[PDB]
Ligand binder design. Structure first.
Ligand SMILES: Nc1ncnc2c1ncn2[C@@H]1O[C@H](COP(=O)(O)OP(=O)(O)O)[C@@H](O)[C@H]1O
Ligand SMILES: Nc1ncnc2c1ncn2[C@@H]1O[C@H](COP(=O)(O)OP(=O)(O)O)[C@@H](O)[C@H]1O
Ligand SMILES: [Mg+2]
Ligand SMILES: [Mg+2]
Lengths: 192, 373, 373, 42, 187
């Protein structure tokens, strides 16, 4: 249960250490070939690309550390299973950004490119493994109590369908507002 | 292996979205936003604020429909963002922050349109990378060619782009606002001539369907008009959504004729054949033979029956008799642009052409003018 | 748990009152106020001033019956207040000041009627909250639908209201004053043809009972008239309260035919079928199909045997042949409005639509025009 | 910074679960619609 | 106007009652300069209420319906029509023209027909088009007092011209070309 995700957590840690090493090597290649003028200055502290791709790798590591903490909270019963997939999606976005950033800024068949791509794919697949392990271990993986409910009264039944259908439209309003809030907080994240 | 890229052809009329490597778009739906124009009485429904895409197409009776894209230029940015939502989360049902997105744009578009597209794609959806391609180049990619002049006629923009051996000739690029939507409006205007009155936006969609079902391009306009005026063979019937049956005669070929005689809608510009010929003549003399031999048509407005024959005849009448003129009109050209994008999104070399969000963060939205043609 | 709401449909001819959540009105009684028109001579009896509801219906011999509601418009406010008091304290036997009250009204009614209803509910009965709903919307609620054209024909008002996906089309609302009471008057007029003289209001009630018991709608009016003129199989007999037996022939179907031929009573308007067709044709072309397929009937006047078949035939003859005409006529439609109100009064969502007396005391009786359709 | 983003994703996904179960509830009501609807009302 | 007169309890149904309502419209309706302020004034004061005697002797009194009826010309949504008001249609028609002639069109707005005889319609049209057009442009609404007969007067002027005498569709041309000749000689 908790030991299962811990093994996958250590797999996550090893894969992210591989990411750190590969990103450092790629940064060495970029500064050696003059692809980018790397500056050893921590702009906006870590930021996202202070001193280059190493900051992106570090932020990926922070995101996956948050993912591991979320998995631990779930296996302790304090985090919803939808927290795990949200943190995993953030980690996937981060590693995709790092991989694409290194992809266009380096040589076509650079060996460091291959190391970064393989290591990022490893982190992605191991993240899905950890997420599925935590969700299946979670007792709230599948649960529903809405199989069949009926009302004898003709008035009661139609009122029942109308209440459920209003619940439809209310949750759909929640769709709109929640997405708009997420979009606003993404725009405010850096605002260029 | 690698994360597949998203290809989203944001046409004026239709949105075609899918994944790189596929041979057909996974989500093709109208790019409309509908808002209710009446009063909701029942409390259990009539409460959603705005409908997007096919949903609006199913509720046009009680909705005002607006296209956020007009003449290839995005005018309502909130509506366009809503449409991009409905594309990513409902139709494709993916997370844009893990897939690079390839977008398309007509040539000679305003710079602010492209900058706002980049800013929205990076700050609202947080895609890892993005790229804005020219629709004609993608259309050429779809046909497996490196040389040819592309006539792309969408819903809002009709543009000619000549390309020779992978090199574009920007000075020879021609653009014309005459497109499918203008044809629909002219069809409404000339359908009022038989007593059929279509006014509302829903009736505009009905007329667009009529245009897509019964209109065709006449090989010879004057002879076709004489035939329609003498015989009644050209007359064709169509059933309205309310059960009324309408019958249209010469209007079947007068509507597409605006493509070749833009003066029908009061525009001074020349027809598509003359624009193509002028674009060819603006190129270097040594490549005109290949451009003549590689006319590639794409876009929904080029799906009219018999349009290829008419274009061939007109350009033959314009070009010297020695040149060999070939109109390439693949049966799947309505998706050609998207298909081309898919190909471009699957190439290993193009993986170096992405605008990563690192460059966007360090250089701002202006970076899209240093990395995209 | 929550205090149940009162649903009181004050029709032109009947009052149907009950509690929210119940499937049938608890109190259905005629909305009449009777006053003695003779001289009282014995001290023990005959001293009451006015009789309301069934009490007046049992004493029509010595009473002058008056309907406080005429053509859906309340004309005698003292009488209507007396009827409401009888409803609350004698029939329902509840305190109106602890239950919110849902009231009904025909569309296109005078604003002063609704304002006076609100003021009486808040200052005379002191209800916690109140709401005026449109009867056709409630009728649609009772049928478990969100789309359809409701034809509600009560005692004083007939009205067509089309609704699509919970949105009403106010410009397409049709109102015709022909209703059950006009049918009763015409039945009296044509019963004078056989020598039966009904003049007094009690005789009007007797004729109303005859209409409810023996009248029906003919599928084909001319064939039915010919059959009645040739055969004697349509001659029905009815026993008057004094034992006299009357026999009526074609009058059984000549009275309801007024609904389809208002010119019988000198009205220039078209029949209910043509009003329904016109209300449909005033709607957007895209929703005419759904309205054709969801003709909802309600009200006591639509209880005539064979009215649904006649309406279906007439609308099929009017509508295009392709579309399918379906008349929805549940056997309990005479209470449908009330039933719908009950449903609307049981919804948790509707609990925010009440006009509370806080809003009434801060905004006045005009508040009813900002919160009720 | 990313805490707000992940929180917004949390709300989005939990509400997505809510929308899905609401869909299930609506369909679950709909199968028994015939039971309390008369024959002419299906 | 019939529909909104039912709101005060006046029921006009028959075609004759439609003619009566048309007369009421011609006698009492006007166009408000500012619709919201006019509605507030009508809801506050009774100065806008006017009386009218029906052919049967009954006297009706109408308030905001005097200006709420012609306002449909500027807000067609009042009758469920999706189209824009007359000011917006005029502005769109001007914008559909060539850019070089928009100035002269802006300065030569000509109104005609009975429906343009409403008191104060010219001022409302001028204000709306001024709000739509660029501030620099000068806008002039030409509303002659006899504009209810402008079409007929122009027809008389045209038919009195010697040059127009050659544009007559003669019954000679009709007998050889049929009714279709009217699509070749008239705009
Ligand atoms: N089979 C057809 N025949 C004629 N016109 C068509 C056909 N299919 C689509 N169209 C027209 O083409 C337009 C869609 O073109 P499309 O290629 O989708 O352009 P865009 O790139 O703007 O989406 C529509 O407005 C429609 O009117
Ligand atoms: N079975 C029936 N057949 C014919 N007419 C009926 C029948 N039942 C009631 N009516 C008529 O319907 C009228 C009552 O309609 P109702 O639905 O009560 O309308 P309201 O909303 O005015 O109460 C009565 O005047 C009566 O004449
Ligand atoms: Mg296109
Ligand atoms: Mg009723």
């Amino acid at each position: 249960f908790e030991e299962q995700i811990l093994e996958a957590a250590k797999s996550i840690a090893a894969a992210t250490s591989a990411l750190v090493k590969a990103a450092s090597a790629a940064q060495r290649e970029l500064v050696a070939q003059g692809k980018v003028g790397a500056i050893p200055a921590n702009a906006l502290d870590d930021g996202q690309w202070s001193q280059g791709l190493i900051s992106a790798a570090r932020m990926v590591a922070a995101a996956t550390n948050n993912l591991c903490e979320a998995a631990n909270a779930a296996v302790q019963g304090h985090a919803s299973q939808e927290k795990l997939i949200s943190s995993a999606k953030q980690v996937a976005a981060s590693t995709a950004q790092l991989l694409v950033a290194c992809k266009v800024k380096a040589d076509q068949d650079s060996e460091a490119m291959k190391r970064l791509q393989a290591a990022g794919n490893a982190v992605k697949r191991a993240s899905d493994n950890l997420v599925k392990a935590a969700q299946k271990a979670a007792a709230f993986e599948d649960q529903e109590n809405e199989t069949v409910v009926v009302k004898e009264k003709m008035v009661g039944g139609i009122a029942q369908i109308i209440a459920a259908q209003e619940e439809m439209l209310r949750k759909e309003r929640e769709l709109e507002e929640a997405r708009k809030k997420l979009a606003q907080i993404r725009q405010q994240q850096y605002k260029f | 292996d690698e994360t597949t890229a998203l290809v989203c052809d944001n046409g004026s009329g239709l949105v075609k979205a899918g994944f790189a490597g596929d041979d057909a778009p996974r989500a093709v739906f109208p790019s409309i936003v509908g808002r209710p124009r009446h009063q909701g009485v029942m409390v259990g429904m009539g409460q959603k604020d705005s409908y997007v895409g096919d949903e609006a197409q199913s509720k046009r009776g009680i909705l005002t429909l607006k296209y956020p894209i007009e003449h290839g230029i995005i005018t309502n940015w909130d509506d366009m963002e809503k449409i991009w939502h409905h594309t990513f989360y409902n139709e494709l049902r993916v997370a844009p922050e893990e897939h690079p997105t390839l977008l398309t744009e007509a040539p000679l578009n305003p710079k602010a349109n492209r900058e706002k597209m980049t800013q929205i794609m990076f700050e609202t959806f947080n895609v890892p990378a993005m790229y804005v391609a020219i629709q004609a180049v993608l259309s050429l990619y779809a046909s497996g060619r490196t040389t040819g002049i592309v006539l792309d006629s969408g819903d809002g923009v009709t543009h000619n782009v000549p390309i020779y051996e992978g090199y574009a000739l920007p000075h020879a690029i021609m653009r014309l606002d005459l497109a499918g939507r203008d044809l629909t409006d002219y069809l409404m205007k000339i359908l009022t001539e038989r007593g059929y009155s279509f006014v509302t936006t829903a009736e505009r969609e009905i007329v667009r369907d009529i245009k897509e079902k019964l209109c065709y391009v006449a090989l010879d306009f004057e002879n076709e008009m004489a035939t329609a005026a003498s015989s009644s063979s050209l007359e064709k019937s169509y059933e309205l959504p309310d059960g009324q049956v309408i019958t249209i005669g010469n209007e079947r070929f007068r509507c597409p004729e605006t493509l070749f005689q833009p003066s029908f809608i009061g525009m001074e510009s020349a027809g598509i054949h003359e624009t193509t010929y002028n674009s060819i003549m603006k190129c270097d003399i040594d490549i005109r033979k290949d451009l003549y031999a590689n006319n590639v048509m794409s876009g929904g407005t080029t799906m009219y029956p018999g349009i290829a024959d008419r274009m061939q005849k007109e350009i033959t009448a314009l070009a010297p008799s020695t040149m060999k003129i070939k109109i390439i009109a693949p049966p799947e050209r309505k998706y050609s642009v998207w298909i081309g994008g898919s190909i471009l999104a699957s190439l290993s070399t193009f993986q170096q052409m992405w605008i990563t969000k690192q460059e966007y963060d360090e250089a701002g939205p202006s970076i899209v003018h240093r990395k995209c043609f």
